[PDB]
Design an enzyme around this catalytic site. Sequence first.
Site, PDB file in Angstrom:
ATOM      1  N   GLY A 193       0.824  -1.209   0.000  1.00  0.00           N
ATOM      2  CA  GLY A 193       0.000   0.000   0.000  1.00  0.00           C
ATOM      3  C   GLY A 193       0.857   1.256   0.000  1.00  0.00           C
ATOM      4  O   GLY A 193       0.401   2.272  -0.512  1.00  0.00           O
ATOM      5  N   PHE A 194       2.065   1.201   0.556  1.00  0.00           N
ATOM      6  CA  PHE A 194       2.898   2.406   0.569  1.00  0.00           C
ATOM      7  C   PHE A 194       3.475   2.576  -0.842  1.00  0.00           C
ATOM      8  O   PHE A 194       3.354   3.631  -1.472  1.00  0.00           O
ATOM      9  CB  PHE A 194       4.012   2.314   1.622  1.00  0.00           C
ATOM     10  CG  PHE A 194       4.945   3.500   1.447  1.00  0.00           C
ATOM     11  CD1 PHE A 194       4.463   4.788   1.678  1.00  0.00           C
ATOM     12  CD2 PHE A 194       6.235   3.319   1.000  1.00  0.00           C
ATOM     13  CE1 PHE A 194       5.302   5.881   1.478  1.00  0.00           C
ATOM     14  CE2 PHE A 194       7.076   4.413   0.808  1.00  0.00           C
ATOM     15  CZ  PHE A 194       6.586   5.692   1.036  1.00  0.00           C
ATOM     16  N   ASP A 195       4.113   1.513  -1.290  1.00  0.00           N
ATOM     17  CA  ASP A 195       4.714   1.546  -2.645  1.00  0.00           C
ATOM     18  C   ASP A 195       3.872   0.654  -3.548  1.00  0.00           C
ATOM     19  O   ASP A 195       4.210  -0.494  -3.819  1.00  0.00           O
ATOM     20  CB  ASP A 195       6.151   1.070  -2.566  1.00  0.00           C
ATOM     21  CG  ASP A 195       6.908   1.274  -3.879  1.00  0.00           C
ATOM     22  OD1 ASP A 195       6.307   1.868  -4.801  1.00  0.00           O
ATOM     23  OD2 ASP A 195       8.067   0.838  -3.958  1.00  0.00           O
ATOM     24  N   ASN A 210      -8.371   4.513   4.786  1.00  0.00           N
ATOM     25  CA  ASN A 210      -8.184   4.718   3.338  1.00  0.00           C
ATOM     26  C   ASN A 210      -9.233   3.934   2.571  1.00  0.00           C
ATOM     27  O   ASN A 210      -9.707   2.847   2.930  1.00  0.00           O
ATOM     28  CB  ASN A 210      -6.757   4.327   2.905  1.00  0.00           C
ATOM     29  CG  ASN A 210      -6.640   2.841   2.644  1.00  0.00           C
ATOM     30  OD1 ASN A 210      -6.923   2.385   1.535  1.00  0.00           O
ATOM     31  ND2 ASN A 210      -6.270   2.062   3.670  1.00  0.00           N
ATOM     32  N   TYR A 262      -8.557   3.819  -1.128  1.00  0.00           N
ATOM     33  CA  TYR A 262      -7.922   4.034  -2.434  1.00  0.00           C
ATOM     34  C   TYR A 262      -8.615   3.295  -3.565  1.00  0.00           C
ATOM     35  O   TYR A 262      -8.789   3.839  -4.669  1.00  0.00           O
ATOM     36  CB  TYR A 262      -6.461   3.596  -2.342  1.00  0.00           C
ATOM     37  CG  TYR A 262      -5.480   4.687  -2.048  1.00  0.00           C
ATOM     38  CD1 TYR A 262      -4.689   4.628  -0.910  1.00  0.00           C
ATOM     39  CD2 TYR A 262      -5.320   5.767  -2.913  1.00  0.00           C
ATOM     40  CE1 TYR A 262      -3.758   5.609  -0.642  1.00  0.00           C
ATOM     41  CE2 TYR A 262      -4.383   6.759  -2.648  1.00  0.00           C
ATOM     42  CZ  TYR A 262      -3.611   6.672  -1.524  1.00  0.00           C
ATOM     43  OH  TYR A 262      -2.688   7.641  -1.215  1.00  0.00           O
ATOM     44  N   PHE A 281      -7.531   0.306  -4.942  1.00  0.00           N
ATOM     45  CA  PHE A 281      -6.560  -0.305  -5.840  1.00  0.00           C
ATOM     46  C   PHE A 281      -6.217   0.590  -7.037  1.00  0.00           C
ATOM     47  O   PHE A 281      -6.252   0.135  -8.189  1.00  0.00           O
ATOM     48  CB  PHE A 281      -6.996  -1.663  -6.385  1.00  0.00           C
ATOM     49  CG  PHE A 281      -6.975  -2.865  -5.490  1.00  0.00           C
ATOM     50  CD1 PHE A 281      -7.799  -3.941  -5.832  1.00  0.00           C
ATOM     51  CD2 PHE A 281      -6.153  -2.986  -4.387  1.00  0.00           C
ATOM     52  CE1 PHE A 281      -7.803  -5.117  -5.097  1.00  0.00           C
ATOM     53  CE2 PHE A 281      -6.184  -4.137  -3.616  1.00  0.00           C
ATOM     54  CZ  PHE A 281      -7.008  -5.177  -3.954  1.00  0.00           C
ATOM     55  N   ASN A 330       2.437  -7.897  -4.166  1.00  0.00           N
ATOM     56  CA  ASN A 330       1.063  -8.133  -3.719  1.00  0.00           C
ATOM     57  C   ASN A 330       0.113  -7.888  -4.890  1.00  0.00           C
ATOM     58  O   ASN A 330       0.175  -6.838  -5.537  1.00  0.00           O
ATOM     59  CB  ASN A 330       0.825  -7.187  -2.535  1.00  0.00           C
ATOM     60  CG  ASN A 330      -0.573  -7.250  -1.971  1.00  0.00           C
ATOM     61  OD1 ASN A 330      -1.572  -7.252  -2.690  1.00  0.00           O
ATOM     62  ND2 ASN A 330      -0.640  -7.287  -0.629  1.00  0.00           N
ATOM     63  N   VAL A 339      -6.871 -11.006  -0.892  1.00  0.00           N
ATOM     64  CA  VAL A 339      -8.312 -11.119  -1.026  1.00  0.00           C
ATOM     65  C   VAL A 339      -9.015 -10.408   0.131  1.00  0.00           C
ATOM     66  O   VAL A 339     -10.100 -10.812   0.559  1.00  0.00           O
ATOM     67  CB  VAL A 339      -8.621 -12.630  -1.059  1.00  0.00           C
ATOM     68  CG1 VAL A 339      -8.188 -13.254   0.258  1.00  0.00           C
ATOM     69  CG2 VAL A 339     -10.076 -12.813  -1.354  1.00  0.00           C
ATOM     70  N   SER A 399      -8.757  -6.613   0.651  1.00  0.00           N
ATOM     71  CA  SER A 399      -9.077  -5.177   0.630  1.00  0.00           C
ATOM     72  C   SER A 399     -10.545  -4.982   0.988  1.00  0.00           C
ATOM     73  O   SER A 399     -11.427  -5.573   0.369  1.00  0.00           O
ATOM     74  CB  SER A 399      -8.897  -4.623  -0.797  1.00  0.00           C
ATOM     75  OG  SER A 399      -9.250  -3.235  -0.724  1.00  0.00           O
ATOM     76  N   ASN A 430     -12.005  -2.295   0.011  1.00  0.00           N
ATOM     77  CA  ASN A 430     -12.337  -1.192  -0.877  1.00  0.00           C
ATOM     78  C   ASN A 430     -12.612  -1.645  -2.307  1.00  0.00           C
ATOM     79  O   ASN A 430     -12.688  -0.795  -3.194  1.00  0.00           O
ATOM     80  CB  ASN A 430     -11.179  -0.162  -0.901  1.00  0.00           C
ATOM     81  CG  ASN A 430     -10.970   0.375   0.507  1.00  0.00           C
ATOM     82  OD1 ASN A 430     -11.988   0.598   1.186  1.00  0.00           O
ATOM     83  ND2 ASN A 430      -9.737   0.531   0.965  1.00  0.00           N
ATOM     84  N   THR A 431     -12.731  -2.945  -2.518  1.00  0.00           N
ATOM     85  CA  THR A 431     -13.164  -3.446  -3.826  1.00  0.00           C
ATOM     86  C   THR A 431     -14.376  -4.353  -3.624  1.00  0.00           C
ATOM     87  O   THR A 431     -14.296  -5.330  -2.882  1.00  0.00           O
ATOM     88  CB  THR A 431     -12.043  -4.209  -4.544  1.00  0.00           C
ATOM     89  OG1 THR A 431     -11.032  -3.269  -4.945  1.00  0.00           O
ATOM     90  CG2 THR A 431     -12.561  -4.927  -5.787  1.00  0.00           C
ATOM     91  N   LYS A 447      -3.300 -12.912   1.942  1.00  0.00           N
ATOM     92  CA  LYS A 447      -3.482 -11.853   2.951  1.00  0.00           C
ATOM     93  C   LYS A 447      -4.961 -11.733   3.306  1.00  0.00           C
ATOM     94  O   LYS A 447      -5.837 -11.569   2.444  1.00  0.00           O
ATOM     95  CB  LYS A 447      -3.003 -10.503   2.373  1.00  0.00           C
ATOM     96  CG  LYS A 447      -3.101  -9.388   3.430  1.00  0.00           C
ATOM     97  CD  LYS A 447      -2.254  -8.206   2.921  1.00  0.00           C
ATOM     98  CE  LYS A 447      -2.350  -7.067   3.975  1.00  0.00           C
ATOM     99  NZ  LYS A 447      -1.512  -5.932   3.429  1.00  0.00           N
ATOM    100  N   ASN A 486      -4.958  -7.360   6.855  1.00  0.00           N
ATOM    101  CA  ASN A 486      -5.280  -6.098   6.155  1.00  0.00           C
ATOM    102  C   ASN A 486      -5.959  -5.134   7.118  1.00  0.00           C
ATOM    103  O   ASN A 486      -6.046  -5.368   8.336  1.00  0.00           O
ATOM    104  CB  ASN A 486      -6.239  -6.437   4.998  1.00  0.00           C
ATOM    105  CG  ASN A 486      -5.971  -5.543   3.798  1.00  0.00           C
ATOM    106  OD1 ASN A 486      -5.925  -4.312   3.906  1.00  0.00           O
ATOM    107  ND2 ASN A 486      -5.795  -6.179   2.630  1.00  0.00           N
ATOM    108  N   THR A 487      -6.467  -4.026   6.595  1.00  0.00           N
ATOM    109  CA  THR A 487      -7.196  -3.048   7.409  1.00  0.00           C
ATOM    110  C   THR A 487      -8.570  -3.567   7.805  1.00  0.00           C
ATOM    111  O   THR A 487      -9.082  -4.540   7.238  1.00  0.00           O
ATOM    112  CB  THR A 487      -7.352  -1.737   6.602  1.00  0.00           C
ATOM    113  OG1 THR A 487      -7.939  -2.014   5.322  1.00  0.00           O
ATOM    114  CG2 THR A 487      -5.972  -1.133   6.370  1.00  0.00           C
TER     115      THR A 487
END
Length: 364
Positions: free
Chosen positions: A65-67, A113, A115, A117, A149, A181, A183, A185-186, A223, A252-253
């Site tokens: 997520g950072f890079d 967040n 984002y 993806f 990832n 699998v 996130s 946010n999707t 993850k 994950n979050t």
Amino acid sequence: MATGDERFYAEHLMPTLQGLLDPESAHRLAVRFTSLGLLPFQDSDMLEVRVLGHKFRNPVGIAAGFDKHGEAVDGLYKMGFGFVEIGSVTPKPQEGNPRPRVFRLPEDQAVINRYGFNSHGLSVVEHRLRARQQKQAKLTEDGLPLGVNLGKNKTSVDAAEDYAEGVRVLGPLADYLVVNVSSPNTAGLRSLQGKAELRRLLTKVLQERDGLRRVHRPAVLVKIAPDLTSQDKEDIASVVKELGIDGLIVTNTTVSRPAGLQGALRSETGGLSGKPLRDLSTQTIREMYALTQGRVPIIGVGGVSSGQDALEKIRAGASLVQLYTALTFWGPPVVGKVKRELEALLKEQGFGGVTDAIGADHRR
Ligand SMILES: Cc1cc2nc3c(=O)[nH]c(=O)nc-3n(C[C@H](O)[C@H](O)[C@H](O)COP(=O)(O)O)c2cc1C
Ligand SMILES: C/C(O)=C(\C#N)C(=O)Nc1ccc(C(F)(F)F)cc1
Ligand SMILES: O=C(O)c1cc(=O)[nH]c(=O)[nH]1
């Protein structure tokens, strides 16, 4: 700025940067600075870990997520991370959600967040990693492995094919791959953690991985979210053992909003990271280690900002840990701080090194 002083970053620089830039701008600026090697601890042997077919010079990695697009990998090793995970990367380029989509909760030492993806896509990331492929081979051989990832596009009609494409394209450039699998946010993504769907998906991923040439064949980890039911966790453990998945990344979050959050932006949609996630993640590591009988390596992630936080996840069953949100509060000095505190605590608790502490809570 150049010395890497924990107080200056924590009390002065980071709070000032957070006052001038919105969170996504700060993220972008940080990737830029890091990627250029404009950054402010000698790893002892006690911190070395061998897992996933690789030597890790220390167990503290930068979380996904950072890079996201593999732009800052060398600068992240320079900051002191023992391993770098880039991504998530989706097959085709996609913009992600509309802005704003990243929110700080400074009173909670947390971030939310959504984002969605945002990704440069596989081809771009493939060429970026190819440009430094042999430099990475030497880093990996030196104990500094690289993880990639993988995610799925928003409009993809076949999730498993998205992940298989990721395995084929970036698998050859990665020491490990992560099937993300989890996130939040999707739409639909977290339902792939369910048993039948996970077994079908991971069977296909592992077949694709196994089809790569042996020096280009990465370990494959899954993850998972911190929000799983007991049933979900038991099913994941069963599938991972049945298929011989190489490891888990936990977690994950969270889509939960723990009682007690104070930030004004606590009710924004998205995944919450940082300190309010910490013990939910630790407890998920503990449960997954027990359900897999300590036979499946776990990379523990969620709310790590100190050596104690790292050691709690290691003792709960993680062989390695990652952090991201702590960097947004404490800056670069937090990496060396976690490592130095972790070494001090291992000595204090009578461990010969990190390896000895992995899963130690389950033996007492
Ligand atoms: C801004 C942001 C973006 C993230 N993007 C991703 C991602 O693309 N893929 C992924 O697997 N995890 C992603 N994560 C989750 C982190 O990898 C990590 O699992 C989570 O934030 C918990 O660690 P932390 O509390 O140290 O931040 C993201 C987290 C943040 C804060
Ligand atoms: C989303 C997010 O990444 C941020 C916010 N808000 C942020 O400050 N990022 C961020 C800030 C500083 C660093 C570093 F430590 F490396 F200098 C890394 C990431
Ligand atoms: O891109 C994102 O929104 C994202 C992906 C993921 O896996 N986790 C997260 O917190 N955000």
